[PDB]
Enzyme design. Structure first.
Site, PDB file in Angstrom:
ATOM      1  N   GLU A  85       2.611  22.341  -5.985  1.00 41.37           N
ATOM      2  CA  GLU A  85       2.031  21.002  -6.211  1.00 41.37           C
ATOM      3  C   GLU A  85       1.252  20.630  -4.955  1.00 41.37           C
ATOM      4  O   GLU A  85       1.800  20.689  -3.851  1.00 41.37           O
ATOM      5  CB  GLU A  85       3.161  20.016  -6.507  1.00 41.37           C
ATOM      6  CG  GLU A  85       2.667  18.618  -6.724  1.00 41.37           C
ATOM      7  CD  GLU A  85       3.788  17.670  -7.051  1.00 41.37           C
ATOM      8  OE1 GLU A  85       3.870  17.249  -8.225  1.00 41.37           O
ATOM      9  OE2 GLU A  85       4.550  17.339  -6.119  1.00 41.37           O
ATOM     10  N   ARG A 138       5.109  21.351 -11.379  1.00 40.71           N
ATOM     11  CA  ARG A 138       4.695  20.144 -12.140  1.00 40.71           C
ATOM     12  C   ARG A 138       3.367  20.433 -12.817  1.00 40.71           C
ATOM     13  O   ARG A 138       2.819  21.505 -12.589  1.00 40.71           O
ATOM     14  CB  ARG A 138       4.613  18.889 -11.264  1.00 40.71           C
ATOM     15  CG  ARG A 138       5.967  18.311 -10.882  1.00 40.71           C
ATOM     16  CD  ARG A 138       5.926  16.824 -10.638  1.00 40.71           C
ATOM     17  NE  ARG A 138       7.221  16.311 -10.199  1.00 40.71           N
ATOM     18  CZ  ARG A 138       7.511  15.887  -8.975  1.00 40.71           C
ATOM     19  NH1 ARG A 138       6.598  15.902  -8.013  1.00 40.71           N
ATOM     20  NH2 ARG A 138       8.726  15.452  -8.707  1.00 40.71           N
TER      21      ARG A 138
HETATM   22  C1  LIG Z   1       3.400   8.385  -0.753  1.00 37.42           C
HETATM   23  C2  LIG Z   1       4.013   7.200  -1.413  1.00 37.42           C
HETATM   24  C3  LIG Z   1       3.952   5.948  -0.793  1.00 37.42           C
HETATM   25  C4  LIG Z   1       4.499   4.829  -1.401  1.00 37.42           C
HETATM   26  C5  LIG Z   1       5.108   4.919  -2.654  1.00 37.42           C
HETATM   27  C6  LIG Z   1       5.683   3.712  -3.290  1.00 37.42           C
HETATM   28  C7  LIG Z   1       6.246   2.729  -2.494  1.00 37.42           C
HETATM   29  C8  LIG Z   1       6.756   1.573  -3.037  1.00 37.42           C
HETATM   30  C9  LIG Z   1       6.721   1.346  -4.399  1.00 37.42           C
HETATM   31  C10 LIG Z   1       7.351   0.085  -4.942  1.00 37.42           C
HETATM   32  N1  LIG Z   1       6.474  -0.867  -5.624  1.00 37.42           N
HETATM   33  C11 LIG Z   1       7.056  -2.209  -5.527  1.00 37.42           C
HETATM   34  C12 LIG Z   1       6.236  -3.213  -6.298  1.00 37.42           C
HETATM   35  N2  LIG Z   1       4.872  -3.264  -5.780  1.00 37.42           N
HETATM   36  C13 LIG Z   1       4.055  -4.240  -6.509  1.00 37.42           C
HETATM   37  C14 LIG Z   1       4.280  -1.928  -5.836  1.00 37.42           C
HETATM   38  C15 LIG Z   1       5.116  -0.907  -5.090  1.00 37.42           C
HETATM   39  C16 LIG Z   1       6.155   2.322  -5.215  1.00 37.42           C
HETATM   40  C17 LIG Z   1       5.629   3.482  -4.660  1.00 37.42           C
HETATM   41  C18 LIG Z   1       5.181   6.171  -3.267  1.00 37.42           C
HETATM   42  C19 LIG Z   1       4.642   7.306  -2.652  1.00 37.42           C
HETATM   43  N3  LIG Z   1       4.675   8.575  -3.267  1.00 37.42           N
HETATM   44  C20 LIG Z   1       4.269   8.914  -4.517  1.00 37.42           C
HETATM   45  N4  LIG Z   1       4.128  10.148  -4.912  1.00 37.42           N
HETATM   46  C21 LIG Z   1       3.616  10.202  -6.211  1.00 37.42           C
HETATM   47  C22 LIG Z   1       3.278  11.469  -6.845  1.00 37.42           C
HETATM   48  N5  LIG Z   1       3.907  12.562  -6.418  1.00 37.42           N
HETATM   49  C23 LIG Z   1       3.593  13.750  -6.975  1.00 37.42           C
HETATM   50  C24 LIG Z   1       2.658  13.849  -7.980  1.00 37.42           C
HETATM   51  C25 LIG Z   1       2.030  12.668  -8.369  1.00 37.42           C
HETATM   52  N6  LIG Z   1       1.115  12.671  -9.326  1.00 37.42           N
HETATM   53  N7  LIG Z   1       2.348  11.493  -7.816  1.00 37.42           N
HETATM   54  C26 LIG Z   1       3.440   8.980  -6.790  1.00 37.42           C
HETATM   55  S1  LIG Z   1       3.855   7.711  -5.698  1.00 37.42           S
END
Ligand SMILES: Cc1ccc(-c2ccc(CN3CCN(C)CC3)cc2)cc1Nc1nc(-c2nccc(N)n2)cs1
Ligand SMILES: Cc1ccc(-c2ccc(CN3CCN(C)CC3)cc2)cc1Nc1nc(-c2nccc(N)n2)cs1
Ligand SMILES: O=c1ccn([C@@H]2O[C@H](COP(=O)(O)OP(=O)(O)O)[C@@H](O)[C@H]2O)c(=O)[nH]1
Ligand SMILES: O=c1ccn([C@@H]2O[C@H](COP(=O)(O)OP(=O)(O)O)[C@@H](O)[C@H]2O)c(=O)[nH]1
Ligand code: NA
Ligand code: NA
Lengths: 229, 229
Positions: free
Chosen positions: A35, A99
């Site tokens: 991935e 994935r």
């Molecule tokens: C790097 C990072 C940084 C931050 C957050 C994060 C932090 C907090 C939240 C909470 N909510 C609370 C409500 N608020 C309004 C919005 C945020 C949500 C996500 C997630 C990540 N990593 C992620 N990796 C993927 C992914 N991984 C592999 C394949 C693919 N396709 N996608 C999707 S997300």
């Protein structure tokens, strides 16, 4: 001859990267496509990916659309390169994907829309792009291997892997991603825009028990599954 | 037989939409692909496009990446539909594009990067996507018709067309876009990642004089140009 395409699916820190690096070594007919997001988390793509991950930690509601579009483009090109590059002298070639384009959309991008990290316009533009980017075909799956782990296992394994930025991930987040995988791959209750997925063969493997030094039973199930495809 | 692909290029309100709607009517062998952005400025694409334009007016530095990616995807799919759909019984089929994937990147997306409406990561991701989206081919141009107008003419024509949101556009903005068109299509000083463009035939037409009711001299130049291709 014709390359078999198998997606390895599972929650964060289920053991996909470990499992795929076990498999790659067991046969010259077996190749793996890691991935891209995972590789950025460890060059122009890696420099872009590293910046997008760091920007995401601060402000997911600003960068989720940009992140998901680049993650899925990076996956498509990496899956196409392996398909057109490798296993050309193999008798029974198998390509294992860490994935798929389907997890990108129906697990991650979906989850970010549901956490209001993308607005409706961003989500409809993403789905429109996804529907189209995946017609301009040779990436359709022969089967899916679901590495099934509890939220608690995955939470423990995040701790084992020890990436600073991941130590903040809460169980509730993992339980939502877990629920989405169960709907999609176990209950098959999740509807998609890809008809063929409804009927794609799925092998579910319980990986709650450590397998790093004891994976023979899992590989036997993978070999049996592959002989049915 | 084989469809000729001609891009009509020009600054905002040069007269591209007027010129293309003149041409479409003069031959059954002649078809036109309007610019999607232009159509959003007048349905799921139009609903997404209308929201993106409105979001852009408020905060270009938030929406420029999302806007440019969707504008260029919408153009590619609209150009491919016309290529695969139309002019199949025509003796000398010509398809006239209102702007190209090259104007999207080297005029507009470039201009937004230069006004700090995209950061370096957004701009490098966009260019990477553009380089790839345009290989996953049948859209390469046989020729370009440059409708050349002064910033002042284009400013006057924005006033004539009377779109509320455009009345704010300043001459300095138009002069920058003008400079970019001159570098690309007259002086040919602009470098791109598409080798063949360096040698693509360009017809430059001066459209400072009103042509709505007096276009025969322009069409004669278009017919002469087409016979050389
Ligand atoms: C790097 C990072 C940084 C931050 C957050 C994060 C932090 C907090 C939240 C909470 N909510 C609370 C409500 N608020 C309004 C919005 C945020 C949500 C996500 C997630 C990540 N990593 C992620 N990796 C993927 C992914 N991984 C592999 C394949 C693919 N396709 N996608 C999707 S997300
Ligand atoms: C709809 C809209 C809304 C706003 C602005 C805008 C407003 C102000 C500025 C000034 N700078 C000052 C410095 N600051 C840091 C950043 C903004 C810059 C642009 C432009 C537009 N229209 C646009 N249309 C295109 C386009 N059209 C056809 C094909 C295609 N590919 N692209 C590109 S942009
Ligand atoms: O059976 C296992 C599977 C994984 N791990 C560890 O759990 C973490 C997560 O595994 P991986 O990186 O493969 O997870 P992915 O995100 O790729 O699913 C890593 O530290 C592994 O070394 C483990 O100790 N035993
Ligand atoms: O020779 C011309 C060309 C254009 N126009 C007007 O100038 C405006 C801009 O033309 P168009 O919409 O074709 O410009 P584009 O943005 O498509 O280049 C419109 O109100 C046209 O009706 C005009 O009066 N005479
Ligand atoms: Na191997
Ligand atoms: Na016609």
């Amino acid at each position: 001859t014709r390359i078999k395409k198998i997606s390895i699916e599972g929650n964060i820190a289920a053991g996909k990267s470990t499992f795929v690096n076990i498999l790659k070594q067991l046969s010259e007919d077996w190749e793996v496509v890691p991935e891209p997001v995972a590789r950025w988390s460890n060059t122009m793509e890696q420099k872009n990916g590293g910046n997008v991950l760091q920007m995401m930690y601060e402000k997911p509601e600003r960068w989720s659309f940009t992140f998901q579009t680049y993650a899925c483009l990076s996956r498509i090109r990496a899956q196409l390169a392996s398909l057109n590059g490798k296993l050309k002298d193999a008798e029974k070639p198998v390509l294992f994907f860490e994935r798929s384009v389907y997890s990108d959309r129906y697990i991650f991008a979906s989850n970010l829309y549901e956490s209001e990290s993308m607005n409706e316009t961003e989500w409809t533009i993403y789905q429109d792009w996804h529907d189209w980017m995946n017609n301009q075909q040779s990436l359709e799956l022969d089967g899916i291997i679901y590495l099934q782990a509890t939220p608690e296992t995955c939470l423990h394994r995040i701790y084992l892997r020890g990436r600073n930025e991941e130590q903040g991930i809460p169980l509730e987040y993992l339980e939502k991603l877990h629920y989405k995988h169960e709907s999609w791959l176990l209950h098959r209750t999740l509807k998609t825009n890809f008809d063929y997925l409804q009927e794609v063969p799925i092998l579910t493997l319980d990986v709650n028990e450590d397998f790093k030094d004891k994976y023979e039973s899992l590989v036997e199930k993978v070999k049996e599954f592959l002989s049915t495809l």
